[PDB]
C-alpha cells in the first residue's frame, strides 16, 4: 500500500529510539528492518509519496536509476552484513578481517555515489526520503568502522579519519535534509485551506519519513554515545479531517493562516487527559462547535486551557475525565454540505468522531464514528494485530479554528485539529542507570522568567529553549530507576553566541558547573554544527528516587543568545 513508507519509517524510528546499543546490533537491525526487507517496488512507494505531495513525478530515466541504485545498495549491504557476522564470530581470522574491510569499503563507496546522485539532481525534494535512508545507512556503516575498525585491522589514523568523516557527515546530511525540507514546505505555502491541507500533509509525511530519522543521527556519534542511549521525539504533528478531506477550499479570508493558527505555539510538553465537547447546530448541520481540554505537565500538575470555539459546560459530551490512557486513533465523520442555486455556501465541519484508547481499545464517541481513520495518516510502529498496543503516536491535544461566515455570506467553517505526539515522549521523565538518558528540555514543567520555548530548527526532534541573559532555563522533575548510589554526570546539548558558564542543580541542593565555549554568532541559522555538548565534570548522585533537576547558564552579557536542546545523564561506572 502507498502507506508503506510511513509504516517502515516509524518501525525504523522505534528501533533507533529503543535499540541503539554498542556492537553489531544496529547494523543487523537496519538490514532486518529496511535493506533486507524492502523490494524495488517498495522503494518506488517512497518516491511516490513525495511525488504525489508536490504533484511532480521524477523524470522516468533518473527515477529508474534511483531504484537501480537502491537495489544496488541492498545487495552491497547484504554482502557486508554477511562478512561482518562471519568476522565477529572469528575476529582473529586474517581472511575474515580482509573480507569485512573490503566489503566495508565497497558499501562506503556505493553510499557515497548514491548520496551524490540524490543531491546533484533537480529532484532533491521527491528523492528526500530515499536520501535519508541512504544517509542513515552510511552513518551506521561509519559507526561500525569506528567501533570495529581496529578489530578489522584498520590502522589508528584510518579509524580516526572515519570518525572525523562520521561527524562531518552527520552535519552535511542533516543540512541537506533540512534545506530540502524547508524549500519543499515553502513551495507549498499558500492562501487557501486546500493549499494548507497539502502543506500540512507534506509537513506530516516528511516529519515521519525524514525529520524523525535526522533527529536521531547524533546517536551515531559512538564516541559521544558509547553505551546504549535513549532519545525522545517531542514535536507535534497535526491531523484535521475537516481541513484535509474537504473537496473545496473554504470560502473564508486568509484560510491558510487561519488553519495554521490552530497549530499550538511552542510550549513545554503537556499531555491531555480530559476532553469535553459541545455540539453546535449551524445552518441545519450539527457539528463540533467547541471543546475544553485539560492536561498534565511532566510534574503531574494540572493545566486548564481556556476553552476552544464556543463551549458551554451545560450538555457537554464527556470524552475523557482525568483518564491516564490517551487516545491513539480518531475515526472522523466530516460534513461538507452546501445548498444549491441560492445558498451556495458550505458548512464544513465534523459531524461525528470516535476516539479509541491506547491499551484498552475502548471507544469514546462524539455523536457517531466515521470512516476517516487517523491510522492511515499516523500508522502503528509495528504490526502485532493490535493497533491499540502498536501505536506510534498518542493524541496530545485538540485545538479548534472557526470562521462564522454564515454572518456575512461566506462558508461556515468549524475545524477541530488533532495534535499528536510520538509515544517516546513520555508523560514523565525517567533516568536509567544503564543508559545515556536524553531528556529534551521541553520536558521541563516550568520556565524561569526570561526563558522562552522557540520552534526547533527541524533537526532536534522538537522545540528548544532560549535565554538572552544569565539565569536558570527551566525546572524538571526526574524519576530515577535502580539504586540511588549510582553516580551520573550531566551533559548539556547547547548552542551559544558567547562563552558561558553552564550548570545543573540537583534536587534543589548542589550546583555543579563548567565553563564552555561560544558555538555560533548572533543571527546565524541553527545547524547541527551550532550545537555542542557541555559535559559538566563533577559526578553526583540523586538523594531521592524522585528529584528536581535544573539547567542554567550564566556569566555572559545580556543580548547574547543561548539555546538548550536537551540534557543527558551519563552513568559513571
UniProtKB/Swiss-Prot annotation:
It comes from the Bacteria. Toxic segment of the protein is located in the N-terminus. Promotes colloidosmotic lysis by binding to the midgut epithelial cells of many lepidopteran larvae. Belongs to the delta endotoxin family. This is Pesticidal crystal protein Cry1Fa. It comes from Bacillus thuringiensis subsp. aizawai. The chain holds residues 29 to 601 of 1174 of the full protein.
Amino acid at each position: 500500500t502507498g502507506r508503506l513508507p510511513l509504516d517502515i519509517s516509524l518501525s525504523l524510528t522505534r528501533f533507533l529510539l529503543s535499540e541503539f546499543v554498542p556492537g553489531v546490533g544496529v547494523a543487523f537491525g537496519l538490514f532486518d528492518l529496511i535493506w533486507g526487507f524492502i523490494t524495488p517496488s517498495d522503494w518506488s512507494l517512497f518516491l511516490l509519496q513525495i511525488e504525489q505531495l508536490i504533484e511532480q513525478r521524477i523524470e522516468t530515466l533518473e527515477r529508474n536509476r534511483a531504484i537501480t541504485t537502491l537495489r544496488g545498495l541492498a545487495d552491497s549491504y547484504e554482502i557486508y552484513i554477511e562478512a561482518l557476522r562471519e568476522w565477529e564470530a572469528n575476529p582473529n581470522n586474517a581472511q575474515l578481517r580482509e573480507d569485512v574491510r573490503i566489503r566495508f569499503a565497497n558499501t562506503d563507496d556505493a553510499l557515497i555515489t548514491a548520496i551524490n546522485n540524490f543531491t546533484l539532481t533537480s529532484f532533491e525534494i521527491p528523492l528526500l526520503s530515499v536520501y535519508v535512508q541512504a544517509a542513515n545507512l552510511h552513518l551506521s556503516l561509519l559507526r561500525d568502522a569506528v567501533s570495529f575498525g581496529q578489530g578489522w585491522g584498520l590502522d589508528i589514523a584510518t579509524v580516526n579519519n572515519h570518525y572525523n568523516r562520521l561527524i562531518n557527515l552527520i552535519h552535511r546530511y542533516t543540512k541537506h535534509c533540512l534545506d530540502t525540507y524547508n524549500q519543499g514546505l515553502e513551495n507549498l505555502r499558500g492562501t487557501n485551506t486546500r493549499q494548507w491541507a497539502q502543506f500540512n500533509q507534506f509537513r506530516r509525511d516528511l516529519t515521519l519519513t525524514v525529520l524523525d530519522i535526522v533527529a536521531l543521527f547524533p546517536n551515531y556519534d559512538v564516541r559521544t554515545y558509547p553505551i546504549q542511549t535513549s532519545s525522545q521525539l517531542t514535536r507535534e504533528i497535526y491531523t484535521s479531517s475537516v481541513i484535509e478531506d474537504s473537496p473545496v477550499s473554504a470560502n473564508i479570508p486568509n484560510g491558510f493562516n487561519r488553519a495554521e493558527f490552530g497549530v499550538r505555539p511552542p510550549h513545554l510538553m503537556d499531555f491531555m487527559n480530559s476532553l469535553f465537547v459541545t455540539a453546535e447546530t449551524v445552518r441545519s448541520q450539527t457539528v463540533w462547535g467547541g471543546h475544553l481540554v485539560s492536561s498534565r505537565n511532566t510534574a503531574g500538575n494540572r493545566i486548564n486551557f481556556p476553552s476552544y470555539g464556543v463551549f458551554n459546560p451545560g450538555g457537554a459530551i464527556w470524552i475523557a475525565d482525568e483518564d491516564p490512557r490517551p487516545f491513539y486513533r480518531t475515526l472522523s465523520d466530516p460534513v461538507f454540505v452546501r445548498g444549491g442555486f441560492g445558498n451556495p455556501h458550505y458548512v464544513l465541519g465534523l459531524r461525528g468522531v470516535a476516539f479509541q484508547q491506547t491499551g484498552t481499545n475502548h471507544t469514546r464517541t462524539f455523536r457517531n464514528s466515521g470512516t476517516i481513520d487517523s491510522l492511515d495518516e499516523i500508522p502503528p510502529q509495528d504490526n502485532s494485530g493490535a493497533p491499540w498496543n502498536d501505536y506510534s503516536h498518542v493524541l496530545n491535544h485538540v485545538t479548534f479554528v472557526r470562521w462564522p461566515g454564515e454572518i456575512s455570506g461566506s462558508d461556515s467553517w468549524r475545524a477541530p485539529m488533532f495534535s499528536w505526539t510520538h509515544r517516546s515522549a513520555t508523560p514523565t521523565n525517567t533516568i536509567d542507570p544503564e543508559r545515556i538518558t536524553q531528556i529534551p528540555l521541553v520536558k521541563a514543567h516550568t520556565l524561569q522568567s526570561g526563558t522562552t520555548v522557540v520552534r526547533g530548527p527541524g533537526f532536534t526532534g522538537g522545540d528548544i529553549l532560549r535565554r538572552t541573559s544569565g539565569g536558570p532555563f527551566a525546572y524538571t522533575i526526574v524519576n530515577i530507576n535502580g539504586q540511588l548510589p549510582q553516580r551520573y554526570r550531566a551533559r548539556i546539548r547547547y548552542a551559544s553566541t558567547t562563552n558561558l558558564r553552564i550548570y545543573v542543580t540537583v534536587a534543589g541542593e548542589r550546583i555543579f558547573a563548567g565553563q564552555f565555549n561560544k558555538t555560533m554568532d548572533t543571527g546565524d541559522p541553527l545547524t547541527f554544527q551550532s550545537f555542542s555538548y557541555a559535559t559538566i565534570n563533577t559526578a553526583f548522585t540523586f538523594p531521592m528516587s524522585q528529584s528536581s533537576f535544573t539547567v542554567g547558564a550564566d556569566t555572559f552579557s545580556s543580548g547574547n543568545e543561548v539555546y538548550i536542546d536537551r540534557f543527558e545523564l551519563i552513568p559513571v561506572t
